[PDB]
Amino acid sequence: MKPMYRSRSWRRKYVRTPGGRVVIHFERKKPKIAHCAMCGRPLNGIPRGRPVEMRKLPKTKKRPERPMPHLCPRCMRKVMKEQIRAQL
Amino acid sequence: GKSLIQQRRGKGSPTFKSPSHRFRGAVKYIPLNYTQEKTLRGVVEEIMHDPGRTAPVARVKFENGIEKLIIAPEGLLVGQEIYIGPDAPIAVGNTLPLAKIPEGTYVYNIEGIPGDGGKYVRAGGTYALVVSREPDKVIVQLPSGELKAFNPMCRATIGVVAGGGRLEKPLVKAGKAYYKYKARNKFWPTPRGVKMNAVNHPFGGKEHHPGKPTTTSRRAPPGRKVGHIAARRTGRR
Amino acid sequence: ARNKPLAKKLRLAKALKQNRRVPVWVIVKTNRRVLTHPKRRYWRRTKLKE
Amino acid sequence: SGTKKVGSAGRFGARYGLKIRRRVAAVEAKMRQKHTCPVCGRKAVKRISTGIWQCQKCGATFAGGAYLPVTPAGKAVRRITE
Amino acid sequence: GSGTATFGKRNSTPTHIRCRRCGRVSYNVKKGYCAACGFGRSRRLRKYRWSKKWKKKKNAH
Amino acid sequence: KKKPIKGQSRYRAKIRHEQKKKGRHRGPGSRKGKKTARMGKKELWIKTIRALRKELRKLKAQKKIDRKTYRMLYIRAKGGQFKNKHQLYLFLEEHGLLK
RNA sequence: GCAUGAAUGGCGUAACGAGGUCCCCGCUGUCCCCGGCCGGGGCCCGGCGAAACCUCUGCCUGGCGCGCAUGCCAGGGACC
RNA sequence: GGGCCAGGGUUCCACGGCAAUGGUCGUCAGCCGUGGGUUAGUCGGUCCUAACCCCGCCCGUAACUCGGCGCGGGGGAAAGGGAAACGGGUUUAUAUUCCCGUACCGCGGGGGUAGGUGCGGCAACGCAAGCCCGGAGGGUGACGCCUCGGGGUAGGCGGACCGGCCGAUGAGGCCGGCUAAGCGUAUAAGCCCGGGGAGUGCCGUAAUGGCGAGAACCGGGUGAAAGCGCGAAUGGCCCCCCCGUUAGGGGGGUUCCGCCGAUCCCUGGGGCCCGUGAAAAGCCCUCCGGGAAUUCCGAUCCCCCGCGACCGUACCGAGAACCGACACAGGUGCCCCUGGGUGAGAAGCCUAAGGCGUGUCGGGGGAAACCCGGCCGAGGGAACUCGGCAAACUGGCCCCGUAACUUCGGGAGAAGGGGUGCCUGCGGGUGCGUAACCCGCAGGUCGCAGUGACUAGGGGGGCCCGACUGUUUAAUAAAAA
RNA sequence: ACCCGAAACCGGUCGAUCUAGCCCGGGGCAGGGUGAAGUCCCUCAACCGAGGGAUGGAGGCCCGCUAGGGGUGCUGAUGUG
Ligand SMILES: [Zn+2]
Ligand SMILES: [Zn+2]
Ligand SMILES: [Zn+2]
């Protein structure tokens, strides 16, 4: 294989073609799941994908429909409560 | 003759240069104009391990929006609030001018002159003791045991540097020493002048003994100051 | 070798075009005086300057 | 877990000397215990890095000594400052 | 070692390549200057009176 | 023409496999690797403990044992008292914990 | 103690070593004492086809001699 | 053997040839002559930044093409980050580039629609969920070493069935029985969200473990590699028939079950650091201000249309295409990949595929002596020699057994002893299994020899030195240095 | 200064594709053994305790013609290779 494909950042898969040939398919690894900005636990409603896969989706299919989608529900509720109590 | 390791170090070659790109950054105080006459409150975001510091570092975000790196004192807690200024309370992790620090207190990261950013008591596990306070100077006992006078406006942090007791455990392995010294690019392993050649060291020779007394004068030229330099005495007392 | 810059490729092209024998009509015109030129090359023995 | 003397230093076999092995075993035995959390008061504190400790229950992260969460100097300064 | 087996490791990047100014294959590619005419290190040509190559170029020696 | 491939036959291998299944070609003089190499340790323990846990859960579901007995047998199985569920059932029969 | 000796360290030391050294069981062609067999060269035939080196030459005994001579003296022997 | 860097630069292909080259010959060739051959929006450069480098100002120098801190600018990876294509076919030589089929990405335009002005869930969340300019925040890009569980796929094995070959038109063996991107589709672990309210404690893992700071237990949300459907049987593969003077034309099938299973992918635990294992471009989301919009504005949603620049692309990739003066037993590159049996094994041996007979001078021969490499040797067993140099003994696995000393970890596989094949039949572990792997028992029997080839330690006791692993005189010293 | 020959000295430049050191970014090491910390279980007794059985995978650990790296002895072949 090429030296560029000898790197382990590529995923190698052996695939049999309909014509009976054996070929190697190379793919790039997916990014890891998003994490909360305050506690670091995994988030929900945000699909994992490379930039092309992310741009293949509409806006509402990438983040949950609730305030502060960058925080997990516990942190979001906590921040809302602190803001409300600070206002009074 | 040939050069010594100390002579070759002064030329700044990559064999002797510090790898100051894998470190977290310099640890200096915020500029003195913010601290003078005003007290700033910050929150500790994270505590990390600086590759070469011998002490953990911490990130502090201040209310004015400035993010800074500080030397974490022992017992510093993530998410806690700290204060810097003349009106700061006397607690671990708070920075105050030396005039407002009561006698008998443990301090670290003391500015040599007001506003330099901190120069003294920065290694892990070290602290200094405030001895006396005067309108013109403040006396502190340093880790080396010397009593030093500082300007009353010099800033210091209350507490003890985290990471003490590091020398309690032996290094055991040459591999452990290799990793420890490679982390900061210190010359390791080290050779011996007696086993060097005569062309290389003042002590070099076929017989592995120093041909002259090992106490060298303070007035010796470069390339000669080896062994015990300007030693007041030698041996075990 | 697989990846080549254009300028180096053009220089190699010039060398390849240079490497050829003297025309028979040139030999006839010169009356067996001009038989060869100093730019003849064998790819495995005499190497290029670049 | 069944060794008379070597303890944690049993991985070294018959190397590095009696004094070094004893010191390593003692330091590691004292370090790898569970320590009381300054926040939640429960024995769930483990060393994350050199001088950094974290509680496994409430997640509190703090800075301490190289091999112990609290050193004598830290205890003295905490007592002085109250 | 140090001989025939050593000479087999000459398959890396060449030290010198062609120079755009003087036309000779003397351009230090890694450092970025010409060892013959000084291109990339000086605006003026690299001429030394102990050297006879520039005179040889025009048969002036 | 394209000549057909002369494949390698496995008739003798199949015959030997059948004999080994019956019990032949298995003596101490036919072994080259260590006993643990032939039947490793962590995998054997995993198989045994998973079988024991599955059997205990099956018994609890069928209600042949109570919750306290299930807990005690779970602790014993983790401790390694039983080398197989035959020994587990022997223990149950001996102590009369099965209803 | 010609002329050891305490961090140019003294003594001891488990484990370790292609380090030097002595002994024991076992083993053997190391040896007594060498003999068979195999493959490749060597050898012959058909081809390609050099180099190191070369004052000219080229037999001995006893001698003279710059003191150990193919070449000189007296003898001996010798077909190519 | 297959693929492909650096380096080489036409050595690649066809035709026509043997004056020279090729360790011999040659009708052959990496040789000579004559004609050809490298086709990209998707592959790589081009973009980002790392170590680092350069230019301008400034300072020093008699001075500079010389030395230098700080400010401003730029560069810097063909194996780091990084938009988008995969089958079949075609040529003597190119193909992810040409032709056919089916797609994707970026920019711009046209027609609709969602939204501007909309809903379902207690919630986690499900949703097409307004346009343009500027800014901020979060996430991703973005990372070490050791180790284990779970899911999956290549590949392999056994059986049934349909064609073909071999075999005796017996038994049996062998061959073919294939499925790309793209599009649609969802669960596992992990993490959450409602209900619930425990301890003379319950729950769970391979293991560590979790619980009033909220456990068992009942529901749900989000979330990978894969599988499945279209693509796709008009394609590829195998077989059969008619025409066969050249040239061609048609007919059949391409289906299931079970087991093993990766060093190839996905996903979670745990452990270690006096060692902490990159940055930026880019992309997604949210939030702030500002602007246009009502017989109007307008998409991240659907349909259609147009455009997409420059350079590399042949070939070897090495016991003849690179470096070493060579068709050099070296080095670069073994840099990436591996069917069946025996076997712990990527060991040795045999063998399938693929390749080769070019690690290129041939012929003769009891055709010797002698040399190099190998096998055997009666009786003795180191008497050889500076010295057991060399050679020889032992050898795998199972079960008994194991000393002085000791830093209590070791020494240790100490030492030493017994067994090992084949056949017949039972028992056990995990398992739904009479699938697969592994562990025992009884009996019969053959040889000089049963780890029968291959693979495969000889051992013990004193003394000196250095604690150990490690390093060294590349090319006479590997050591106590 | 009849002609040739030195080891050496001095100036300015050229080299880290060999090799030495260090920095940034990457690729690799079949199979087997031993069994440290840690986490435990069971039995008999109970004033002491004694015995047995697991799990766990650490090591500049061990065997190893895996790959790769090194170069002890034969002072072996070769030594106009
Ligand atoms: Zn959160
Ligand atoms: Zn806590
Ligand atoms: Zn130039």
UniProtKB/Swiss-Prot annotation, chain A:
Pfam families: Ribosomal_L34e. One of its GO terms (biological process) is translation. Residues 45-71 are annotated as: Disordered. One of its GO terms (molecular function) is structural constituent of ribosome. It comes from the Archaea. Keywords: Ribonucleoprotein, Ribosomal protein. InterPro entries: Ribosomal_eL34, Ribosomal_eL34_C_sf, Ribosomal_eL34_CS, Ribosomal_L34e_arc-type. One of its GO terms (cellular component) is ribonucleoprotein complex. Belongs to the eukaryotic ribosomal protein eL34 family. Part of the 50S ribosomal subunit. This is Large ribosomal subunit protein eL34. It comes from Pyrococcus furiosus (strain ATCC 43587 / DSM 3638 / JCM 8422 / Vc1).
Curated annotation (Swiss-Prot), chain C:
The keyword Ribonucleoprotein applies. Keywords: Ribonucleoprotein, Ribosomal protein. GO terms for biological process: translation. It holds the Pfam family Ribosomal_L39. GO terms for cellular component: ribonucleoprotein complex; ribosome. One of its GO terms (molecular function) is structural constituent of ribosome. Gene3D superfamilies: Ribosomal protein L39e. The keyword Ribonucleoprotein applies. Part of the 50S ribosomal subunit. Belongs to the eukaryotic ribosomal protein eL39 family. NCBIfam families: PRK01242.1. This is Large ribosomal subunit protein eL39. It comes from Pyrococcus furiosus (strain ATCC 43587 / DSM 3638 / JCM 8422 / Vc1). The lineage of its organism: Archaea, Methanobacteriati, Methanobacteriota, Thermococci, Thermococcales.
Curated annotation (Swiss-Prot), chain D:
Binds 1 zinc ion per subunit. The keyword Transport does not apply. Its cofactor is Zn(2+). One of its GO terms (molecular function) is zinc ion binding. Keywords: Metal-binding, Ribonucleoprotein, Ribosomal protein, RNA-binding, rRNA-binding, Zinc, Zinc-finger. One of its GO terms (biological process) is translation. One of its GO terms (cellular component) is ribonucleoprotein complex. A zinc finger (C4-type) spans 37-58. Zn(2+) binds at residues 37, 40, 55, 58. The keyword DNA-binding does not apply. Pfam families: Ribosomal_L37ae. InterPro entries: Ribosomal_eL37/eL43, Ribosomal_eL43, Ribosomal_protein_eL43, Ribosomal_zn-bd. Part of the 50S ribosomal subunit. Belongs to the eukaryotic ribosomal protein eL43 family. Putative zinc-binding subfamily. Binds to the 23S rRNA. HAMAP family: Ribosomal_eL43. PANTHER family: 60S RIBOSOMAL PROTEIN L37A (PTHR48129), LARGE RIBOSOMAL SUBUNIT PROTEIN EL43 (PTHR48129:SF1). This is Large ribosomal subunit protein eL43.
From Swiss-Prot, chain E:
Its cofactor is Zn(2+). InterPro entries: Ribosomal_eL37, Ribosomal_eL37/eL43, Ribosomal_eL37_CS, Ribosomal_zn-bd. GO terms for cellular component: cytosolic large ribosomal subunit. A zinc finger (C4-type) spans 19-37. Binds 1 zinc ion per subunit. One of its GO terms (molecular function) is zinc ion binding. It holds the Pfam family Ribosomal_L37e. Zn(2+) binds at residues 19, 22, 34, 37. Coiled coil: none annotated. NCBIfam families: PRK04179.1. Binds to the 23S rRNA. Part of the 50S ribosomal subunit. HAMAP family: Ribosomal_eL37. Belongs to the eukaryotic ribosomal protein eL37 family. This is Large ribosomal subunit protein eL37.
